[PDB]
Amino acid sequence: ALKPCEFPQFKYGRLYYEESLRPNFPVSIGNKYSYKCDNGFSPPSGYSWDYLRCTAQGWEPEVPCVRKCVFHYVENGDSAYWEKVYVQGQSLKVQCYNGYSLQNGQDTMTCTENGWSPPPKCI
């Protein structure tokens, strides 16, 4: 069987069980391995862990761990009741109060490589 996927090493995270598994590589298309990301980062799905999949295009995702932005508290705005995870590239509309705003027309925040932009502070 073809074994085209080498031991996956990527930024801001790692496979679980890296030492029981590293010698098993390379592996075949269809195999998958659980992984986690560093604090402040997340799989694109926004879950606490996810699968790295050996595909015909190599490992997917290409960038397994991306910036994580948590939505919860908004100063002078509407806060949520529990922490909602967002990932790099996602955006939401924040509800500001009493003539305060995020100063970007639509009161939208985007999860960027360096966190929320602008921050969840209505001014």
Numbering used by the authors: 339 to 461
Please quote the authors directly.
Factor H binding protein (fHbp) is a 27 kDa surface lipoprotein consisting of two β-barrels that promotes resistance against complement mediated lysis and is a key meningococcal antigen that elicits SBAs. We have shown previously that fH CCP 6 and 7 (fH67) are necessary for high affinity interactions with V1 fHbp, and that these two CCPs are sufficient to inhibit binding of full length fH to fHbp. Here we characterised members of the three variant families by identifying amino acids that are critical for fH binding and through structural analysis, to inform future vaccine design and to understand the basis of the interaction of fHbp with fH. Here we show that even though V1, 2 and V3 fHbps exhibit remarkably conserved atomic structures, differences in key amino acids necessary for interactions with fH are only revealed by functional studies.
As fHbp binds human (hfH) but not murine fH (mfH), novel models are required to assess the efficacy of fHbp-based vaccines. Therefore to develop a physiologically relevant model to test non-functional fHbp vaccines, we sought to define the basis of the binding of fHbp to hfH but not mfH. Alignment of the amino acid sequences of hfH and mfH revealed multiple residues located at the site of interaction with fHbp that differ between the two species. Therefore, we next humanised 13 residues in mfH that span the region corresponding to the interaction site of hfH with fHbp. However this extensive replacement of residues was not sufficient to enable mfH to bind fHbp at appreciable levels as demonstrated by far Western analysis; PPX, the meningococcal exo-polyphosphatase was used as a control on blots. The overall CCP folds are conserved despite many sequence differences between the two species throughout the two structures, including the surface where hfH interacts with fHbp. Additionally the arrangement of CCPs 6 and 7 in mfH with respect to each other is distinct from hfH, distorting the entire shape of the potential interface with fHbp. We also demonstrate that impaired binding of the murine fH to fHbp is not solely due to amino acid differences at the binding site; structural analyses revealed a different orientation of CCPs 6 with 7 in the human and murine molecules that would sterically inhibit interactions with mfH. Initial efforts to achieve this by introducing multiple amino acid changes in mfH proved unsuccessful, most likely due to the orientation of CCP 6 with 7 in mfH which would sterically inhibit interactions with fHbp. The chimeric fH consists of mfH CCPs 1–5 and 9–20 (enabling interaction with murine C3b and other complement components), flanking hfH CCPs 6–8 (allowing binding to fHbp).
